[PDB]
């Protein structure tokens, strides 16, 4: 679609897990359940404003779930916990 440089899907939300973080662990899997309830409110947010760009939840466990679902972009070194937008909301100056 337009207003997006890549191919996306509004059916659900993609999940990004850092390379150095093992998916399937108890910490990750528990976080991977209760964040599935964000899919409906991801859709509900986008219905009033169809001009809405990426909505992302950066968990303290390391995984980042964003909407709409779209494939991730050499090795991967992205960690959501080190991003500037995550850091300013984690603490104060």
């Amino acid at each position: 679609d337009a207003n997006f440089g890549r191919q996306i899907s509004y059916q659900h939300a993609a999940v990004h897990i850092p390379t150095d973080i093992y998916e399937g662990s108890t910490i990750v899997l528990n976080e991977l359940n209760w964040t599935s309830a964000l899919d409906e409110v991801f859709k509900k947010n986008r219905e009033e404003d169809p001009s809405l760009l990426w909505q992302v939840f950066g968990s303290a466990t390391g995984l980042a779930r964003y909407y709409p679902a779209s494939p991730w972009v050499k090795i991967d070194l992205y960690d959501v916990r080190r991003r500037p937008w995550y850091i300013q909301g984690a603490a104060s100056p």
């Binding site: 390379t19 150095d20 973080i21 093992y22 998916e23 399937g24 662990s25 090795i75 070194l77």
Partner: peptide, 21 residues
């Protein structure tokens, strides 16, 4: 052994600028 599962980032020859999975 529970933490030793999955993939990890290895740095060749101790160089932080040359990682391998």
């Amino acid at each position: 052994p529970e933490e030793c599962r999955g993939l990890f980032i290895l740095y060749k020859d101790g160089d932080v600028d040359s990682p391998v999975v």
